[PDB]
Amino acid sequence: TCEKNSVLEVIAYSSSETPNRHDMLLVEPLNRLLQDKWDRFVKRIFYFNFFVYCLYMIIFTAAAYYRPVE
Amino acid sequence: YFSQRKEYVASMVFSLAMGWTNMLYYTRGFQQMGIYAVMIEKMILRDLCRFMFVYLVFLFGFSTAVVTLIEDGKYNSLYSTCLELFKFTIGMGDLEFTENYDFKAVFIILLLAYVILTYILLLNMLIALMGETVNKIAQESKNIWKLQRAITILDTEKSFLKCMRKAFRSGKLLQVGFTPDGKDDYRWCFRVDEVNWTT
Amino acid sequence: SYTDSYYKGQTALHIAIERRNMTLVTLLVENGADVQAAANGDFFKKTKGRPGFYFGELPLSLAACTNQLAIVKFLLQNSWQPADISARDSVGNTVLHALVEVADNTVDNTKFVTSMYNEILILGAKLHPTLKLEEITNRKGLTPLALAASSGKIGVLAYILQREIHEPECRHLSRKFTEWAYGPVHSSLYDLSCIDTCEKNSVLEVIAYSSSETPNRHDMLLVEPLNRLLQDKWDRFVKRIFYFNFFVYCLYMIIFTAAAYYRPVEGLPPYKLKNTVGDYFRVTGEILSVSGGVYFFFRGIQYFLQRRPSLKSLFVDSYSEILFFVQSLFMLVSVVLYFSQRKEYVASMVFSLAMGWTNMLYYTRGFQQMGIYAVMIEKMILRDLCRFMFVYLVFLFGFSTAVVTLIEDGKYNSLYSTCLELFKFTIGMGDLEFTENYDFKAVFIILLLAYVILTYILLLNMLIALMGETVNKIAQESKNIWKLQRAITILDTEKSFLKCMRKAFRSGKLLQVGFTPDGKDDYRWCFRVDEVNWTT
Ligand SMILES: C=C(C)[C@]12C[C@@H](C)[C@@]34O[C@](Cc5ccccc5)(O[C@@H]1[C@@H]3C=C(COC(=O)Cc1ccc(O)c(OC)c1)C[C@]1(O)C(=O)C(C)=C[C@@H]41)O2
Ligand code: NA
Numbered sequence: 001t002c003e004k005n006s007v008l009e010v011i012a013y014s015s016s017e018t019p020n021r022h023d024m025l026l027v028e029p030l031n032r033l034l035q036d037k038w039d040r041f042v043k044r045i046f047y048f049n050f051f052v053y054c055l056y057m058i059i060f061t062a063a064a065y066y067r068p069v070e
Numbered sequence: 071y072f073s074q075r076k077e078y079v080a081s082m083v084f085s086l087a088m089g090w091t092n093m094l095y096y097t098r099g100f101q102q103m104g105i106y107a108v109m110i111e112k113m114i115l116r117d118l119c120r121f122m123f124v125y126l127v128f129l130f131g132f133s134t135a136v137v138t139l140i141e142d143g144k145y146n147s148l149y150s151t152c153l154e155l156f157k158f159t160i161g162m163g164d165l166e167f168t169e170n171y172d173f174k175a176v177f178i179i180l181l182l183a184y185v186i187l188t189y190i191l192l193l194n195m196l197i198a199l200m201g202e203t204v205n206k207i208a209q210e211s212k213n214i215w216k217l218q219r220a221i222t223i224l225d226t227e228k229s230f231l232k233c234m235r236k237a238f239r240s241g242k243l244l245q246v247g248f249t250p251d252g253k254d255d256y257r258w259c260f261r262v263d264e265v266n267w268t269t
Numbered sequence: 270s271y272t273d274s275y276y277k278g279q280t281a282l283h284i285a286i287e288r289r290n291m292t293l294v295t296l297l298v299e300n301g302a303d304v305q306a307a308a309n310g311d312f313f314k315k316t317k318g319r320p321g322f323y324f325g326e327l328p329l330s331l332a333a334c335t336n337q338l339a340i341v342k343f344l345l346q347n348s349w350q351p352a353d354i355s356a357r358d359s360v361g362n363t364v365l366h367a368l369v370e371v372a373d374n375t376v377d378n379t380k381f382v383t384s385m386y387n388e389i390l391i392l393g394a395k396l397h398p399t400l401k402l403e404e405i406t407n408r409k410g411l412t413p414l415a416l417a418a419s420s421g422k423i424g425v426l427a428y429i430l431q432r433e434i435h436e437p438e439c440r441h442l443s444r445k446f447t448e449w450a451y452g453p454v455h456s457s458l459y460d461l462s463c464i465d466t467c468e469k470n471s472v473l474e475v476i477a478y479s480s481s482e483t484p485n486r487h488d489m490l491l492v493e494p495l496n497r498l499l500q501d502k503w504d505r506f507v508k509r510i511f512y513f514n515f516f517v518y519c520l521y522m523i524i525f526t527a528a529a530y531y532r533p534v535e536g537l538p539p540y541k542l543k544n545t546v547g548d549y550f551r552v553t554g555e556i557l558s559v560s561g562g563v564y565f566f567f568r569g570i571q572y573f574l575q576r577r578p579s580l581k582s583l584f585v586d587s588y589s590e591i592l593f594f595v596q597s598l599f600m601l602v603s604v605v606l607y608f609s610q611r612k613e614y615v616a617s618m619v620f621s622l623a624m625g626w627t628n629m630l631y632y633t634r635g636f637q638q639m640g641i642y643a644v645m646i647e648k649m650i651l652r653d654l655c656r657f658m659f660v661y662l663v664f665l666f667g668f669s670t671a672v673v674t675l676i677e678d679g680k681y682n683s684l685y686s687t688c689l690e691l692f693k694f695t696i697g698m699g700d701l702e703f704t705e706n707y708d709f710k711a712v713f714i715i716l717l718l719a720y721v722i723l724t725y726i727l728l729l730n731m732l733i734a735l736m737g738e739t740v741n742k743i744a745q746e747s748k749n750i751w752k753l754q755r756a757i758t759i760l761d762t763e764k765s766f767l768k769c770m771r772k773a774f775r776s777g778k779l780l781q782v783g784f785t786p787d788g789k790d791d792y793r794w795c796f797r798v799d800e801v802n803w804t805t
Contacts, residue, residue, distance in 0.1 A: 001237060001258075012221045022213035025220055032262050034220055036239060042226045050096045057089050064086055064674050067079065080712045083671045087716065090667025094660065106660050109731055118727070156718075157701055160725060200727070201734040208738060263320045267373065 008033075098218045105211045108218075109204055117200050125192065129155055132184045136177070143171055159188040270306075277310035278326065286331045286340055294340055304328050304344050304352045309359050315370070325367030326358040333364050334371045336381045338388055345392055354393050355400060361407035364389055369413045372422045374485065379424035386428070394439045398786030410470060414463065418475040421483035423492075426472075430459070430494050441782050441791065453803050458781060458795040459494045465763075465773070466794070473499075477757045480582050487749035490756055497798050498775055499756055506773075507762045515632045521561050522625050528554025529622050538607050538614065562600030562621070569594030588647055589631045596624040634754040641747045644754075648743065649736055657732050664728065665691060668720045672713070679707055695724045 002009075011024050018024075025031060071078040094110070097103040133151050140146045145154070157163055163185070167178060207214065227237055239260045247254035270280040282302045285293035298304060307326045315323040324334040329352045332340035341364075344352040357363055362370065365386065372382045393402050406412055417425040433445040444460040464472050476489050483489075490496060531551055533540050542548045572590050584591065599621035606614035630646070633639035669687045676682045681690070693699050699721070703714060743750065763773050775796045783790035 008220065008224060012217070012224050022210075022217055025216050028264065029260070029262065031216070033239065033260070034216065034223060037223050037227075038219060042223050045226050046099070046222060053093070053096070057093065060086060060089055061670050064082055065670065067082075067674070069677055079675065080709055083675050083712065083716070086674060087667045087671040087719075090663055090670070093663050093667075097660070102656060103659070106657070106731070110727065113727055113731070153703070160721070161697060162699065162701060196726075197730050200730055201737075204731055204734040205738060208735070265320045265322075267378075 099222055101215045104215055104218055113200055121196050139173055158185055275310045275312045278308035282328050283308055286328055299349050304350050305356050325362050330364045330367040333368055333385050363405050365402055365413040366407050369417045372425050374424050383428045415470050418472045421485040423485040423488050426492055430492055441785055446781050454801050456799040458797055460793050461796040462793055477760050481586050490752045502759050507759050510762050524554050525558040528558055559604055562597045565593050566597035592628050596621050635758050637751050640751050644750050648739055653736055694721050697725050
C-alpha cells in the first residue's frame with residue numbers, strides 16, 4: 001500500500017531490461033508476502049477464473065460447431 | 071454476421087483456435103507447466119521472427135527462378151510454386167522427375183540445391199538455435215515462476231471487482247511507539263519467522 | 270513453564286541450555302529443576318508447515334543437539350538430579366534419535382554430531398554397562414541406524430557402519446574391528462547386525478524401499494560394508510536365480526505368443542477340443558498363459574499390500590510392478606470375455622501380449638550396459654510426455670474444432686478423422702493435397718499451415734530437446750542406478766525364494782571382542798572384508 005507507486009508494482013511491471021528482475025523477488029519479505037497472498041485468497045480466485053474461462057470456451061465451441069449452413 | 075456476409079465464419083474460426091490456445095496462459099504460475107508457455111513465447115518472438123527473413127529470401131529467390139524456367143506446367147505460377155517449395159522445406163515433397171518439359175536437368179539441379187539448402191542446412195540450423203533457447207531457460211523456471219505468480223497477484227488485487235480492499239497482512243502493530251516527538255507509530259508490521267542452521 | 274500451544278513445556282532449564290549459560294544450568298539443577306521434562310510445543314516438534322527447532326523436547330537432547338558436552342556430562346553425572354540417558358520423547362526419539370535427526374550431511378555438522386554421538390555412547394556404557402541405547406526404537410519402530418538410513422544421513426551412516434573405538438572397557442560398542450594390516454592392504458571384521466537380518470526393519474530394506482525422495486539414496490549403497498555385502502550376495506546365489514527367472518519368463522512369453530497366434534477363427538468361444546495334437550498343444554499353451562497371468566496378479570497384490578504406496582509416489586516408484594500387474598489384468602479380462610461367449614477377448618489378449626514382450630526390458634535392469642535404457646524410457650514416459658500431453662492436446666483440440674467448424678460436408682467434417690489427420694501432421698506424415706472444391710480454401714490453408722508450423726517445427730523439437738536433456742542427465746548416472754536396481758533385485762530374491770530356507774548369511778558366527786562389561790562373550794555374525802588403499 002503506497003498510494004503512488006509501490007515496490008511490487010515497480011518490480012512486476014518493469015520493462016524486462018532490469019538486470020535483476022528475478023532476484024529482487026527473492027528478498028525475504030517480498031517472497032513471504034507473495035506466498036501469503038497466494039495461499040490466502042488469490043489461489044482460489046485464479047482457479048475460479050480458469051474454470052470460468054474453460055466453461056466459456058466450451059460454450060463457444062458448442063455454439064460455433066452447430067452454426068447454420070443456410 | 072450482421073452485415074449479411076458469409077465471411078463471419080472465417081473470422082469466428084480463427085478466434086476459436088486462439089480461444090483454445092490462449093488457455094496456455096493459465097499454465098503460467100505453475101512451477102512445472104509455465105515453462106512450456108514461456109519457452110513458446112521466447113521462441114516465437116526471437117527465433118522464428120529473425121529466421122523468417124533468411125527463409126523468405128531463399129524461398130523467393132528459388133521460387134522466382136523456378137517460375138522463370140518452366141513454360142506452362144503445374145509450377146508456372148508463384149502461388150503453387152511457393153507452396154510446393156515450402157512443403158519441400160519441411161520434408162513433405164515428392165521429387166517425381168518423370169515430366170516432359172525442356173530444361174529438365176536445370177530444374178533438377180535448382181530443386182535439389184533448394185532441398186539441400188533448406189531441408190538439411192537451414193532447418194537444422196534453426197532447430198539447433200531453438201534447442202539452445204529451450205535449454206537456456208529450462209533451469210530458470212524457479213526464477214521465472216515466482217515472477218509470473220507475482221504479476222497475477224497484483225492484477226487480482228488491482229481489479230478485485232467486489233469493492234473490498236482487505237490487502238493488509240497483519241495487525242496495525244506498534245514497532246517502536248516513541249518517535250522523536252510524543253507521538254507513537256503503528257505501521258502494519260508483518261511477522262516473519264526464519265530459520266538458519268549456521269553454527 | 271510456557272502453557273501455550275507453541276512453547277508448551279519450555280522451562281528455565283531449556284532456556285539456560287539454549288543460551289549456553291553453564292552457570293544458570295548448574296544453579297537451576299541444584300535448585301530442584303526437572304532435567305527430564307518434555308518441551309512438546311508446536312514450535313519444538315517435528316513439523317513441515319511451520320518453522321521450528323525440533324531437538325527431542327528434553328534438556329539432555331537440547332544440550333546434545335547444540336554441541337555442549339559439559340552440560341550433558343553434568344546432567345547425567347550430577348548427584349543433585351541425574352538425567353535418564355534412555356528417556357524417550359512423545360515421538361519415542363531418544364538423544365541418539367535426536368542427534369541423527371538434526372544432521373544435514375555437511376562437514377561441521379558431521380563432525381560435531383559424530384563427536385557428540387560418540388561421547389553419549391561412551392557415557393552410557395560407562396554409567397550403565399547393561400544399557401544398549403542403539404537397540405531402542407522410536408514410535409515408528411526405527412533404531413537410530415534405521416532412522417539415519419531412512420533420512421539419507423550419509424555422513425552418520427559413514428560413521429556408524431565403520432565405527433571403531435580404541436579405548437578399553439568400551440570396545441564392545443565398536444562395529445568395525447581390524448584383524449590385520451599390511452602396506453596397502455588391510456582386513457577388518459564388520460558387525461553386520463541389522464544390515465540384512467533384523468526381523469523388524471533392516472538397513473538394506475530401508476535404503477531399497479525408500480520413497481525416492483531421499484537425496485543420497487544412491488550414495489548410501491557405496492558405503493563399504495553394504496557394497497561388498499551386496500556384491501557377494503550377487504555372486505553367491507542371486508545371480509543364478511535371476512538368470513533362471515529370466516529364462517523362465519522367456520519360455521513363458523514364447524508359449525503365450527505361439528498359443529495366441531494359432532487361435533481359431535470360428536465365432537462364439539469357447540471352442541471344443543478335437544482329438545488331435547494341435548488342439549492339445551494349443552489348450553496347453555492357453556492353460557499355461559492364464560496360469561502365468563494369475564501368478565503375476567497375485568504377486569502384484571502381495572507387493573501393493575506389503576508396501577502400501579501412496580498415490581503421489583504410486584508411479585514414481587513401483588513402475589515395473591504396475592506394468593506387470595496391468596498385464597495380468599488384461600489376461601484376466603481376456604479369460605472373462607472368453608468364457609462370456611464374446612469374440613472381444615481377442616482384443617484384450619492382444620494388448621497383454623504386447624506388454625508381455627515389452628516388460629522384458631525389466632530384466633535389463635541390473636546390467637551396467639543395458640539397464641540404462643529401461644530407466645531412460647521410464648523417466649521419459651513419466652516426466653516429459655505426461656506434462657507435454659496437455660499442451661499438445663490444447664493445440665490439437667483447438668485447431669481440430671476450428672477445422673471441423675469450417676468445412677461443410679467433406680472428408681474433414683468429423684472430429685475423428687480430423688484429429689487423426691492432424692496427429693499425422695504433428696509427426697510429419699501428412700499429405701497436403703489442396704486440390705479440392707470447398708469454399709474458404711485460403712482460410713483453411715492458413716489454418717492448417719499455422720498448425721503445421723506450430724506443432725511440427727516448434728512444439729515437437731521443444732519436446733525433443735527436453736527429452737535429450739533428460740537422456741544426457743542420467744547417462745553418467747548409470748553406475749548409481751545400476752547399484753540401486755541390483756540391491757532391489759537381491760532383496761526381492763531373498764524375500765520369496767520358494768524353498769522356505771534363508772541361508773543367506775554372509776559369514777560365520779564369529780566373535781569380535783568376547784569381553785562384555787559382564788562375564789559373557791559375544792558372537793555377532795561378523796563379516797570379513799579386505800581393502801586396498803595406496804595412500805602414502
Ligand atoms: C499404465 C501405463 C503407465 C502405460 C500402460 C501402457 C498403455 C503403456 O503406455 C503408457 C502410456 C503411453 C502410451 C503410448 C505411448 C507412450 C506412453 O505407458 C505405460 C505403458 C508403457 C510401455 C512402454 O514400456 C516401457 O516403459 C519399458 C519399461 C521400462 C521400465 C520398466 O521397469 C519396464 O518393466 C516393466 C518396462 C508399454 C505399454 O504398456 C505397452 O506395451 C502398450 C501397448 C502401451 C504402453 O501407459
Ligand atoms: Na518424413
